[PDB]
Amino acid sequence: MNINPYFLFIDVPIQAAISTTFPYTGVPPYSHGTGTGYTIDTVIRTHEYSNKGKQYISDVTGCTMVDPTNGPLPEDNEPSAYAQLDCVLEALDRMDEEHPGLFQAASQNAMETLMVTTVDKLTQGRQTFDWTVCRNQPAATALNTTITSFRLNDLNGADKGGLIPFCQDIIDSLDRPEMTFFSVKNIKKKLPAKNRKGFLIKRIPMKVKDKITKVEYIKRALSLNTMRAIATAGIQIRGFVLVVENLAKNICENLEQSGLPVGGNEKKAKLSNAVAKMLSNCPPGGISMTVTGDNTKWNECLNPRIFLAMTERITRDSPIWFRDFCSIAPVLFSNKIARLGKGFMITSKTKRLKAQIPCPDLFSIPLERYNEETRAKLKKLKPFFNEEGTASLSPGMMMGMFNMLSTVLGVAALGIKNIGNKEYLWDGLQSSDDFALFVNAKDEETCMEGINDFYRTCKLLGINMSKKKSYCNETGMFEFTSMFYRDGFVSNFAMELPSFGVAGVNESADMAIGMTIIKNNMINNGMGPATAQTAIQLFIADYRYTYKCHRGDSKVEGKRMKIIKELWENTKGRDGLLVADGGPNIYNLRNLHIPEIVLKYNLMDPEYKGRLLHPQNPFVGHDYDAVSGTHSWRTKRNRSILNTDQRNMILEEQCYAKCCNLFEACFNSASYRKPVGQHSMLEAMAHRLRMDARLDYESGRMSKDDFEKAMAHLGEIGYI
Amino acid sequence: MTLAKIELLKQLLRDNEAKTVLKQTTVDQYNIIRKFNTSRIEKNPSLRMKWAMCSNFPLALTKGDMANRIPLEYKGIQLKTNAEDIGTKGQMCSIAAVTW
Amino acid sequence: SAEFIEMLHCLQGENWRQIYHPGGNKLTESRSQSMIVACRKIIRRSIVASNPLELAVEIANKTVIDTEPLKSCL
Amino acid sequence: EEPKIPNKCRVAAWVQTEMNLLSTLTSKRALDLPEIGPDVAPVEHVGS
Amino acid sequence: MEMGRRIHLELRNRTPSDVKELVLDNSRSNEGKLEGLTDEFEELEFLSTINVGLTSIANLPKLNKLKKLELSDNRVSGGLEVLAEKCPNLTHLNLSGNKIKDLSTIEPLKKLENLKSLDLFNCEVTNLNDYRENVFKLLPQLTYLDGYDRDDKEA
Amino acid sequence: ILCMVFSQDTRMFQGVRGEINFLNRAGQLLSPMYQLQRYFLNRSNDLFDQWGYEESPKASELHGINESMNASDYTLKGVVVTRNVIDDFSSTETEKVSIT
Amino acid sequence: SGKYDPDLGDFKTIEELEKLKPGEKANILLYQGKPVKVVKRKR
Secondary structure (H helix, E strand, O other): OOOOHHHHHHHOOHHHHOOOOEOOOOOOOOOOOOOHHHHHHHHHHHHHOOOOOEEEEOOOOOOEEEEOOOOOOOOOOOOOOOOOHHHHHHHHHHHHHHOOOHHHHHHHHHHHHHHHOEHHHHHOOOOEEEOOOOEEEOHHHHHHHHHHHHHHOOOOHHHHOEHHHHHHHHHHHOOOOEEEEEEEEEEEOOOOOOOOOOOOOOEEEEEEEEEEEHHHHHHHHHEEEOOOOOOEEOOOOHHHHHHHHHHHHHHHHOOOOEOOOOOOHHHHHHHHHHHHHHHHOOOOOOEEEEEOOEEOOOOOOOOHHHHHHHHHHHOOOOOHHHHHHHHHHHHHHHOOEEEOOOEEEEEEOOOOEEEEEEHHHOOOOOHHHOOHHHHHHHHHHHHHEEOOOEEEOOOOOOOOOOHHHHHHHHHHHHOOOOOOOOOEEEEEEEEOOEEEEEEEEOOHHHHHHHHHHHHHHHHHOOOOEOOOOOOEEEOOEEEOOOEEEEOOEEEEOEOOOOOOOOOOOOHHHHHHHHHHHHHHHHHHHOOOHHHHHHHHHHHHHHHHHHHOOOOOOOOOOOHHHHHHHHHHHHOOOOOOOOHHHOOOOOOOHHHOOOOHHHHHHHHOOHHHHHHHOOOOOOOOOOOOOOOOOOOOOOEOOOOOOOOHHHHHHHHOOOOHHHHHHHHHHHHHHOOOOOOOOOOEHHHHHHHHHHHHHHHHHHHOOOOHHHHHHHHHHHHHHOOO | OHHHHHHHHHHHHHOHHHHHHHHHOEHHHHHHHHHHHHOOOOOOHHHHHHHHHHOOOOEEOOOOHHHHHOOOEEOOEEOEOOOOOOOOOOOEEOHHHHHO | OHHHHOOHHHOEOOOOEOOOOOOOOOOOOHHHHHHHHHHHHHHHHHHHOOOHHHHHHHHHHOOEOOOOEHHHHO | OOOOOOOOOOOOHHHHHHHHHHOOOOOOOOOOOOOOOOOOOHHHHHHO | OEHHHHHHHHHOOOOOOOOOEOOEEOOEOOOOOOOOOOOOOOOOOEOOEEOOOOOOOOOOOOOOOOOEEEEEOOOOOOOOOHHHHHOOOOOEEEOOOOOOOOHHHHHHHHHOOOOOEEEOOOOOOOOOOOHHHHHHHHOOOOOEOOOOOOOOOOO | OHHHHHHOOHHHHHOOOOOOOOOOOOOOOOOHHHHHHHHHHHOOOOHHHHHOEOOOOOOOOOEOOOOOOOOOOOOEOOOOEOOOOOOOOOOOOOOOOOOO | OEOOOHHHOOOOOHHHHHOOOOOOEEEEEOOOOOEEEEEOOOO
16 A cells, blocks of 8 residues: 555645645755855846846946836846836825825834934844954944944944934945944964863954945945845944834835734734625626735845835925935945855865865956856856955845835735726735735636736836746635635644744743743644644653753652652642642643743642742842742853953963963862962962972871972962 | 972062963963863853753852852752852852752 | 733634633632532533433532532532 | 756655555554643643 | 475485475576476475575465465565465465565465465565555454564464 | 883882782782882872973973873973984894793 | 572563463563562463
């Protein structure tokens, strides 16, 4: 009997059968390498779909620029980035007329939020491209480095605290003839280390001051570095994109078509409501069709100039300063420069050699030495390449940075609802990459005529529908963002599942975080009761393994398990003991939002309650919900190097190695005989030698003459 | 030999730099250089705590009468340490201590 | 409802709905609030078993609300 | 150096045997998960 | 070496009805047969045929006393129903290393009722889901198999 | 360690701290030389501590080694490590040898 | 019938106990450190 798993589809609808095909909503490790080649291909494709536009030379950054907007309309079904401004303006006009007082209110709310916001908001983000060092650093570190450089350059926006002064100082820094900043430089090492020679070589960083001309800083600020996001943007762009996205979110929240920022069962409600609404107003005897459309090269076709036009149209009645503030982001994106990453690698098999060619030296060697695909890619990329290992890139959107504005543009495309006053009405939903289109007509022929008209219209707006990944069927069954809807039933394609291990804070905190994660997964991603209970079981298993807190009545052995077993033997209320103390777990679906301390309080032993919740215990000392007890301990978090200046100047003197060598013998002869606790190493040596001489004389290793000589020298030391 | 170490220490003290570094730098500071010399930071918090718990004294401890109330040893099991720590500026306690 | 969102994880799902009602300091009809549920369980135990009459009367005669038989409370 | 694109291969008969055998019931089990609190709500009973 | 040489060595040039067992191993056969064993045989208990290149079972004396037979490392693939008409008194069957395609090949053993142990190792039929259960309900007379019916005993 | 024991240096004798009553797998009492060999090999850090230290071999290549065997200066009294190649054991005559 | 006899061998699993024949002696383990020696019986 040869199994055939696909045969399940015979007895089960495919929508349910393929539920949760991918356990991971993130990124796999085996995805096609996103290196210099991938970014080169991305820029090549971005410039390829817009090569019929206007090509010119930027007078600021001196880089090639391509502008496809208002360019010739496509004559082929291939992707096109030529979005006419008039069509976009008309679509925005239609949206505004349909929703009176929407753009004004959204712009007002966005500007008020910007006025009340603070620079600290910029720290909530993923890896950010720091320009001072030209790398990827955490948001907080990047913001701190930018602030320090601004202070060095007589720019103190962060001092005022507001975000508006910070962005004003950013755009002012874009005007300084020379920009001075701090940078980190690594220098080799010569300090001792015991492997076989008491000598090792490493890298130590130091802070230095570096200055850059105006054009260099201008190019650096617009740079987009690469680490399914393809690149990250520095700090000079973060505030403006934040404001523009807040505006777009304010607009979208009141757009019934927008599929964002819906999350949870609200998504299912929106899907079913849209289907029901479209079916209700279907013409008597007409036909309703549904397209699960997808967009190819979504972010490689949208143009920053079109986003600038959308921002200008939306904020047509708003203070001029806010209009400029909103416009600062699209103009920055329209001049974005991509960084190609590390570079390539070329090898010689005959001599068994290999080397890494960095981006600036990409063209330093004949193209014949690159494989076919890289040769062609470099040949095509030559015009859009800079001498500093960067590529000019005017068009494109390099994945998600204006997702809300993309959704707004898609909703505008969906809001036309008719072309030529034909016998079809279209509508649907769209969330920043994917759209579901519902069209009502008389016969399927007119429905497909309407679908064709919608395809042409979105082409006019620069949105390219995917013919190779889209299909149409009678309304009632479709998909929308990995969520299959079928005549009321709803299923998910990919659902994130709890990862192995505890959260990584502490016993009570880890338990609370795990339970709240399970609860959130149930609420949002739609995890069934049995799956949630199994997740609880797995989390308990992992927690017990990590904290070595198996059941008190178990037969396992461990350093902590002996005390756990003794406590279990001495305790009467064994149902009230916490899991961390080998007690029984009692968590279930109905009580996934209650801390275990509160759950078990009524069953705890009063003596155990006092010991556990002692107001002054030595462990606690000085989101999720838990109880502050003896299980809220803190782990030692102290590493790296402090006292950097003193340590560096000491290590750079000379005699440190001799001190280490003298220390090593005596204080390694025994595993631990160090009077540690801030004792000066000289004092510890004096005490150690005094004790060694005492022991030598007592055992007879030394005569009285050597004894007295040693004490004489020890007397001369100063600690005797 | 005690005398050999003594004479070597005197010879080293003849030089000013060695005398200064020995007078100022403490035994606690001696460990720090070795750490960065052959140690650095890690990631993956879930596994980080897994490694930390298996160690002897991963838990920070407060200073006070209650901290000293718990013993150093218990049925052949260590609980805390006497010598002061650098980072926390206080004692460090083993996981079992909490259970105690 | 403030008291309904907190439990939402156990109330509503993608394709199921749990009928749940809140509570809070509804004390006074203690004895009654007890007997009913106890009685309910008896029926739940008797309907499944064959010939529910004798089993139901047996369980009802041998049940005590913490001091007294269910018959007195009823 | 040129990229070693994956080769092209025909149907492998051992994958069918893998699927057939891995779906059989053996004489041993290797799963021991911890316990959960008592079930009260009907949804908990269904999940259990 | 040939089947005849093995027959002569085992019988030592005596009457056919003098040995209740045979060892036909490492013997070349004409087109994959078991020649050299005449139908005159009347008493036989154990059999052993390994590396004989037997491709089919069509030549075998009619018998009523054999209880064990051993076939291995052969490319035989065909119906075994003929065993019922030739010797429906088999108790130990060994097909380890043989070449059988699907379950249908082992069907004709249903009509035999005295079989208690059947061996099928590294057989193309052995790599299937519920092959153990499917064979069991297909041959109810079977009391043993590759060795793990319910316990472990030795032949 | 072995050259130390063989040399019969008075410091090696004065560095003993335990006891010498060991035997072999056959259960025989050995001569004091081999008993000391086994004692010192079992406890290497016995004569090393009290042997005494000597300044490093200040020179182009001659460099010292500490008690921990790391290529660290402040070497043992007498011991020297040269960054050259020592080639020895010439004239392998295989001279006549008797067997008791 | 007796006590731990390393000579007879290590502890025997239930699989070997079930296939054992009458009159044959085996070794079993109750818990850690308390082995015992048993013998099959017809009754």
